[PDB]
Design a protein around this ligand. Structure first.
Ligand SMILES: CC(C)(COP(=O)(O)OP(=O)(O)OC[C@H]1O[C@@H](n2cnc3c(N)ncnc32)[C@H](O)[C@@H]1OP(=O)(O)O)[C@H](O)C(=O)NCCC(=O)NCCS
Lengths: 8, 162
């Protein structure tokens, strides 16, 4: 679930 | 528009659907090693529910791993292809997932979140404060100090989606 901001 | 559990049964059909989903995951999760996504998606413990458009095209999905005896599952990856975002699919998927988890006798959903991500799961009903005894996931779900562990309680008779 690695997340670095963004993602609409 | 269907939300089906995609079985990794070694058939050309499912294999292709899983690969398409895996590619949506890497394109949408750039910080994630692609080979790591490959490993989890196709391993013996993980399962995937896909958003199927016209019973043939994958436009999203969620990869998860159930810990049946413990009655909780971990979300590995969640994503909707770029050209299909902001149309409510992602939220509908999560609701279908909760309903499926409830039917699977799963009591809690766990997932690691970072940055923006945290905000997304909070809107999906996940919280930073856990009500599930820590020693329950300890030893099953890796404990990373670098990520925020979030959980969502799945009440046995609350209606999630459908
Ligand atoms: C959602 C994906 C999960 C499919 O979803 P498709 O909040 O809700 O404004 P469905 O920016 O439209 O939405 C539920 C809502 O939360 C929004 N949002 C997304 N991440 C968010 C976050 N971290 N915090 C707050 N809002 C967020 C959704 O885009 C959507 O828009 P809205 O709030 O105006 O309705 C999406 O981009 C995607 O594939 N993102 C990249 C992959 C990713 O980060 N996956 C989860 C981590 S593995």
């Amino acid at each position: 679930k690695g997340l670095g901001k963004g993602g609409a | 528009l269907d939300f089906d559990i995609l079985t990794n049964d070694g058939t050309h059909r499912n294999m292709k659907l899983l690969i398409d989903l895996k590619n949506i995951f890497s394109r949408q999760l750039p910080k994630m090693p692609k080979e790591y996504i490959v490993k989890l998606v196709f391993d013996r413990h993980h399962e995937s529910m896909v958003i199927l458009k016209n019973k043939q095209k994958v436009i999203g999905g969620i990869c998860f791993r159930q810990y049946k005896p413990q009655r909780f599952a971990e979300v590995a990856f969640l994503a909707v292809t770029a050209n299909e975002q902001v149309r409510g699919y992602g939220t509908r998927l999560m609701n279908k997932f909760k309903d499926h988890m409830q039917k699977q006798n799963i009591e809690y959903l766990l997932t690691y979140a970072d940055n923006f991500a945290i905000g997304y799961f909070k809107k999906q009903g996940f919280t930073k404060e856990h009500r599930m005894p820590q020693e329950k996931w300890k030893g099953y779900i890796k404990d990373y100090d670098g990520g925020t562990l979030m959980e969502c309680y799945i009440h046995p008779y609350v209606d999630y989606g459908r």
